[PDB]
Design a protein around this nucleic acid. Structure first.
Ligand SMILES: [Zn+2]
Lengths: 321, 191, 203, 488, 125, 82
DNA sequence: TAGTGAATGTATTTGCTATATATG
DNA sequence: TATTCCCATAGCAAATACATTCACTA
């Protein structure tokens, strides 16, 4: 019922300045105030609008101060109503504009429970359990022998000697991912985001010793390092059969043009995530000196670390059957 | 006191899907069985089922066959009932218009088995009414109980592809892909 | 006389140049499937803060008279908020003062029905049920399990929660060891409360 | 036990009334007519629109209600909004009906509506929770509490009180009671209270008021203030009329400058409006108010008063009998407040209150816009604005005192099921002894809410077809003898 | 037999808190997450603190409240139990030199609101 | 010797405050970009009825790792606190 | 050199705004 | 833990599905 000519702002309606105002409007909120700012009856209208508004929470939550509401409503009335009894029309327009999905409501909360206890959003982890796991992570030798009891004490001791030096450095995602994988048989993985830094540094040394014992020196060198200064989640043909046996639960894929797609191995997804993190930056070695020599190794990345990481995951899969 | 034993009936509800998946609480190295069947009993520690959050980067740790059998009290969520109670009924609601389903493969054999039988039960109910409506055009009178039952069947069965899917709710609570309800009975010894 | 003395002594701290907006924790907005819920007494605080913001956000710069008039309206809104908040949220039966400053929901507590010890006994001893003992003494048992049986924290927590609803001989032995280790006291100290609390004896 | 013993025990034991034991809410809401197959609740909806048809513009009709198929029932509750179809799978006991309206022979859009269904034992499931629906023991016709006659209509509720005013007759000061009631609500939104004689003067002329009802030829026995009214030397009703007239006149003497203007009609209306509320608006406003007042006596309320023995056909006849026959209830009541014999077990009047509210407001909209041409689009928007999908059931679990949560640890249906009785005072959220409690209630069953035994229903009570409590003759003498000793 | 067989017993050593840092109430979703109800019990009301302040004394009474109102103090209690040789015979649970009084959340909220209004409660000199 | 009431000096509180100071005067709510930032500092918003699965965080919830406690966020310029 | 899958760009669909006397 | 409903319609933004290309692997 409206008209677009540029007067697009009047297209949903049911005088001399109408074209100029429409063009200015077309060229972020409450733009009527600015167009009114370009340019008694004015005071009478302002008083009437203030009376209409005189007789909320939703306006305040949307950012409309109670002082600014009459001015905005007056600008809307002047632009969208006067340009097209007048008193009754203005009254109805103001009343409609004052109170315009269910999720857009702004309700009043009604608060034996106290007013503070009325807000019922919980944390997910018991505070006492976090304190318990902080102490647990300090028992490195006990934890390592809970996973593989054949690890010599000297190897664990050498790894733990570097904790003090690397305690001043910040920990990076690739370090935590590998520690979570290896240590999960004795230490929960999700606790890594809750334990303090000193607890994490001990676990990083613990996992490094286990990888050293198993024969994965090429990847164990990156557990205790410092930051110096194509992304395909597919599994190589060599290991695809083994990984599907050890991690049978895979992620389903969206069908393309009705054609079904084979599931993607979730364990392969995590391998690529760790592989991408390692090569995202250069690292400075801080770990045991003897381990650095056994890896044929500031710290250069071997061209086949993804294969080594895949074999490490294969070892863990066999160990946790 | 052995002659003054009451019996209690209660229901446990679990939701899985986009946020969490079921754990292997009643199965073995070769079978995935999240919850006991009809006629089974609740295992001695009292856990009926438990769910673990979705996280792909922790798959080599949290998704090993051993980790799926071990319940973590601090970080998982479980529903606990009376140990030794006998499961007598199961009801499952599924949201089939998900592409792709967030459930990992091999974790829904038990869920599908009960849902398939339940769908057949509701499908036959809707078929019976439609046959009656065809024969008795404008002469078909049904009780208020039967009318609400047919409404439930349509809420359960999948919608035709031509129309928008249903967003199922339980009293302002949105359903996930799977909703499981387990009913069990326990006999109490007064002491 | 009192009001004159108050002003004459505190006149140096009654006209500040800055005012602090209350903490983020005071104003809590909860958005749900049926809208966003807010606390009504907070309204004046929101209005007062927005009023000062609108002074520099006006399209036409405000004249000095209009600047003062809007400033006073904002200040009058702050005064309304603090009085109403103290009257409605700090000072009432489920208020901040009477529910959290002079009361609390404590950790390491239990609640159950009571029965009698009619056999020969000491008048100041208590017997707690198995389920209460396992959950109340969770960290006491975890300490013993780690040391005696070389359990990890995850295993100890799993062991305790597993045996809440069933009898376990190992747990029973640890319970006696905990009680016997409270020497020279007869057992573990506790307080028993009966409501309503009027006389010495209800606690 | 010996099988012969049980037969002799059974032979010697009276049986309860199956209507009360099986649940009376079910019998009053879901019972279907054998001829037509439509239940009591739907018939109640039809009766509501019959009494409201007098406010309908010409050409507008109510065509009845129809049962919806489950397919439409499913489609209506899963209607798409904002590209989303919300389905609530929590179990409920609801069924859907359509309300049919026509305008000048053209059928309008049907309005779907949900209604609750009850099962054996007064059981109903609403949004996944189980409830019990109990009857309410209510007075028939009218209720008296304290110098007040409460009369409930389908669209209004009126209370009649008393005041005393002084008038001078033949030079002798006299005191008479003036009956008043508040019938307009902006009067509450606001000293003189609205007198019934003032309403009579607003409707009829003062001379007409006296001659038509009191058969008194009032002129201009001499009655004066404390202007003359003259009556032949050869009633109480006339005395009340005189007292009300002087009660109105004394506090508004400027209006009556000339005596003849007393016999007018517009002046009384102006005074009434100034009591309630500019003269121009006031005169027009009441002319509509008196129009709605003259049509406030619905047919259903007439039948209720007929049982008590009032026999009123127009609202003016009711006011006459309040001033003549029911006046003594204001100061000397002869009805025992603590009795339980002349009462009725009512279900629908409290169950369908929210729907009844919608029907009344729909009729009032037509009254407020009389003498107007109606378009089909306007009528469709009006119907949609009032009769919505969940109009009737939107507050069943909020403030209905006859619906309560169910908690029954055993299989018995009587103990806390069909034996719950709700007093009229607690219908929407004690008293001294009476021998009727032993017959209607359970005087030893004393819950905390009703320690006097009136909160439970005797399962052997005799109840009529419409829910009226009847008397049992085989225990009449023993009940009567105890009542004498209670008050002695 | 009568109902209420006492199956709704509660016992908890550590409970989950709010964003504010105080023990929270239990909803139906968390009711069955544990074999028994792990809810903090309001064992110290205003009336009890009136009685304790007179018999036991204001000193020890403040210690009991602070061990919960201050979440860091509660963390110290758990560590004392776990590291103790005899968990049931700990001399002192909270070392008040390392964690001094003044960390209670309800009191800090009280002081903050009054400070914004422009006043503070202080000891009389 | 009992408790009495004092009067605080607000500008002294302002002077002794530590950290970057945000003034509500420098915010135009009409600009939808500035309204979001204003609501970031004023309200403590909860997007649903779900439990908070985090122990420490910065102001803008960019860091939820307990081992980074004390490190200042680069997006909200807020230290990571418990 | 042949087969395959990730990165990229582009056309299509759909959800999202923005305006439109009256019942103790 | 919160519900008892949401006027119709044209343009836009972002999400989504499909085709194309280049680099890695066999
Ligand atoms: Zn941040």
């Amino acid at each position: 019922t409206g008209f677009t000519e540029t007067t697009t702002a009047y297209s949903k309606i049911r005088r001399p300045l109408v074209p100029i105002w429409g063009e200015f409007i077309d060229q972020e909120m409450h733009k009527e105030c600015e167009v009114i700012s370009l340019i008694t009856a004015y005071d009478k209208l302002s008083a009437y609008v203030k009376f209409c508004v005189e007789d909320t929470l939703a306006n305040l939550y949307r950012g409309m101060s109670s002082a600014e509401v009459p001015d905005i409503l007056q600008a809307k009335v002047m632009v969208r109503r006067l340009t097209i009894s007048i008193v009754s029309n203005m009254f109805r327009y103001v009343k409609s504009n004052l109170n315009p999905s269910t999720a857009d409501r702004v309700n009043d909360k009604r608060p034996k429970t106290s007013f503070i206890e009325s807000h019922k959003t919980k944390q997910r982890v018991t505070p006492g359990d976090i304190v318990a796991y902080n102490l647990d992570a300090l028992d490195v030798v006990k934890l390592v022998h809970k996973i593989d009891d054949t690890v010599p004490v000297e190897l664990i001791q050498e790894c733990l000697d570097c904790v003090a030096v690397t305690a001043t450095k910040d920990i990076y995602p690739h370090q935590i991912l590998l520690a979570q994988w290896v240590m999960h048989k004795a230490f929960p993985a999700r606790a890594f985001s809750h334990i303090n830094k000193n607890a994490v540094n001990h676990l990083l040394a613990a996992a490094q010793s286990l990888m050293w014992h198993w024969g994965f020196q090429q990847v164990a060198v990156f557990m205790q390092v410092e930051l110096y200064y194509r992304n395909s989640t597919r599994i190589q043909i060599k290991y695809k059969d083994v990984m599907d046996e050890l991690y049978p639960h895979q992620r389903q894929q969206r069908a393309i043009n009705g054609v079904p797609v084979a599931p993607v191995n979730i364990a392969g997804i995590a391998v690529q995530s760790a592989h991408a993190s390692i090569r995202s930056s250069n690292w400075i070695y801080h770990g045991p000196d003897r381990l650095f020599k056994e890896a044929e190794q500031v710290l250069v990345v071997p061209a086949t670390i993804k294969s080594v990481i895949t074999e490490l995951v294969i070892h863990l899969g066999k160990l946790n059957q | 006191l052995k002659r003054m034993m009451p019996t209690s009936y209660s229901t446990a509800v679990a939701n899985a899907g986009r946020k969490a998946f079921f754990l292997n609480m009643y199965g073995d190295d070769k079978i995935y069985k999240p919850f006991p069947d009809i006629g089974d009993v609740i295992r001695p520690d009292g856990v009926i089922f438990a769910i673990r959050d979705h996280d792909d980067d922790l798959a080599p740790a949290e998704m090993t066959p051993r980790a799926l059998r071990t319940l973590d009290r601090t970080f998982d969520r479980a529903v606990i009932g009376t140990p030794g109670a006998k499961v007598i009924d199961i009801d499952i609601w599924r949201d089939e218009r998900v592409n792709p389903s967030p459930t990992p493969t091999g974790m829904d054999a038990q869920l599908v088995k009960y849902h398939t039988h339940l769908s057949s039960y509701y499908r036959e109910l809707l078929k019976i009414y439609r046959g009656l409506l065809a024969r008795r055009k404008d002469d078909l009178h049904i009780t208020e109980e039967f009318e609400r039952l047919i409404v439930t069947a349509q809420m359960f069965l999948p919608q035709p592809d031509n129309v928008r899917k249903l967003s199922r709710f339980y009293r302002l609570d949105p359903l996930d892909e799977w909703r499981v309800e387990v009913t069990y009975k326990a006999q109490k010894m007064p002491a | 006389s009192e009001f004159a003395q108050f002003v004459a002594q505190n006149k140096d701290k009654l006209f500040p140049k800055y005012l602090p907006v209350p903490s983020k924790l005071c104003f809590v907005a909860e958005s749900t499937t049926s809208g966003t819920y807010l606390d009504k007494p907070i309204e004046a605080a929101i209005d007062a803060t927005l009023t000062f913001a609108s002074i520099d956000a006006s399209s036409v710069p405000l004249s000095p008279i209009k600047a003062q008039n809007r400033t006073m309206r904002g200040l009058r809104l702050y005064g309304q908020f603090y009085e109403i908040y103290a009257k409605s949220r700090i000072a009432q039966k489920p208020g901040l003062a009477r529910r959290h400053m002079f009361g609390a929901r404590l950790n390491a507590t239990a609640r159950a029905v009571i029965t009698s010890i009619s056999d020969p006994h000491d008048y100041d001893e208590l017997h707690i049920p198995w389920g209460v003992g396992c959950q109340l003494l969770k960290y006491h048992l975890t300490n013993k399990l780690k040391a005696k049986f070389n359990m990890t924290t995850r295993e100890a927590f799993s062991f305790v929660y597993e045996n809440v609803l069933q009898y376990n001989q190992i747990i029973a032995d640890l319970f006696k060891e905990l009680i016997a280790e409270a020497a020279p006291y007869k057992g573990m100290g506790c307080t028993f409360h009966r409501n309503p609390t009027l006389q010495r004896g209800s606690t | 036990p010996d099988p012969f013993l049980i037969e002799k025990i059974r032979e010697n034991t009276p049986c309860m009334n199956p209507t009360l034991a099986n649940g009376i809410t079910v019998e009053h809401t879901m019972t279907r007519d054998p001829n037509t197959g439509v239940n009591m609740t739907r018939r109640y909806i039809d009766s509501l629109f019959d009494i409201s048809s007098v406010l309908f513009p010409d050409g507008f009709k109510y065509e009845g209600n129809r049962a919806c198929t489950p397919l439409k029932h499913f489609e209506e509750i899963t209607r798409e909004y904002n590209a989303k179809r919300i389905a609530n799978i929590a179990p409920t006991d609801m069924y859907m009906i359509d309300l049919m309206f026509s305008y000048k022979g053209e059928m309008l859009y049907p309005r779907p509506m949900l209604l609750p269904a009850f099962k054996r034992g007064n059981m109903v499931t609403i949004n996944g929770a189980k409830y019990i629906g109990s009857p309410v023991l209510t007075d028939v016709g009218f209720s008296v509490l304290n110098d007040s006659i409460f009369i409930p209509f389908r669209r209004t509720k009126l209370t009649f009180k008393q005041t005393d005013h002084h008038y001078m007759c033949n030079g002798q000061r006299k005191i008479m009671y003036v009956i008043w009631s508040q019938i307009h609500n902006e009067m509450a939104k606001r000293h003189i209270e609205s007198c019934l004689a003032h309403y009579f003067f607003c409707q009829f002329g003062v001379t007409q008021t006296f001659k038509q009802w009191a058969n008194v030829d009032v002129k201009c026995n001499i009655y004066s203030s404390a202007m003359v009214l003259v009556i032949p030397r050869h009633s109480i009703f006339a005395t009340r009329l005189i007292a009300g007239f002087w009660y109105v006149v004394d506090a508004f003497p400027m209006r009556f400058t000339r005596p003849e203007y007393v016999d007018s009609t517009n002046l009384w209306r102006v005074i009434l409006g100034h009591m309630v509320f500019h003269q121009g608006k006031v005169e027009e406003n009441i002319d509509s108010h008196l129009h709605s007042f003259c049509n406030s006596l619905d047919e259903m309320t007439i039948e209720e008063l007929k049982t008590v023995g009032v026999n009123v056909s127009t609202i003016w006849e009711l006011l006459y009998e309040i001033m003549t026959s029911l006046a003594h209830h204001l100061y000397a009541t002869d009805i025992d407040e603590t009795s339980m014999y002349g009462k009725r077990l009512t279900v629908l009047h409290y169950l369908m209150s929210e729907f009844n509210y919608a029907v009344s407001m729909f009729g009032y909209m037509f009254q407020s816009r009389r003498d107007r041409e109606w378009t089909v689009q306007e009528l469709n928007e009006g119907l949609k604005r009032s009769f919505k999908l969940q109009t009737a059931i939107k507050r069943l679990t909020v403030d209905h005192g006859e619906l309560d949560t169910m908690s029954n640890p055993n299989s018995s249906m009587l103990i806390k099921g069909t034996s719950i009785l709700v007093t009229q005072d607690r219908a929407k959220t004690s008293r001294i002894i009476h021998a009727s409690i032993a017959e209607v209630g359970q005087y030893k069953n004393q819950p905390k809410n009703n320690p006097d035994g009136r909160g439970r229903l005797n399962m052997y009570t005799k109840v009529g077809p419409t829910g009226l409590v009847e008397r049992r003759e085989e225990v009449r003498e023993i009940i009567d003898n105890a009542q004498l000793m209670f008050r002695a | 037999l009568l109902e209420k067989i006492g199956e709704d017993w509660s016992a908890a050593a550590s409970v989950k808190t709010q964003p504010f840092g105080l023990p929270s109430k239990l909803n139906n979703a968390d009711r069955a997450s544990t074999p028994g109800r792990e809810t903090a019990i309001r064992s110290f009301g205003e009336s009890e603190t009136r009685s304790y302040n007179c018999t036991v004394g204001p000193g020890p009474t403040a210690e009991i409240l602070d061990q919960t109102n201050n979440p860091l103090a509660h963390a110290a209690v758990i560590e004392s139990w776990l590291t103790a040789e005899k968990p049931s015979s700990v001399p002192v649970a909270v070392d008040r030199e390392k964690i001094p009084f003044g960390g209670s959340r309800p009191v800090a909220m009280f002081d903050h609101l009054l400070e914004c209004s422009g006043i503070a409660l202080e000891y009389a000199p | 010797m009992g408790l009495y009431a004092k009067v605080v000096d607000h500008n002294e509180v302002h002077d002794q405050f530590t950290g970057k100071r945000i003034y509500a005067n420098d915010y135009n709510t009409s600009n939808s970009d500035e309204k979001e930032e204003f609501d970031r500092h004023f309200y403590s918003h909860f997007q649903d009825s779900e439990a908070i699965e985090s122990s420490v965080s910065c102001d803008c919830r960019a860091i939820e790792d307990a081992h980074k406690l004390g490190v200042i966020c680069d997006i909200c310029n807020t230290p990571v606190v418990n």
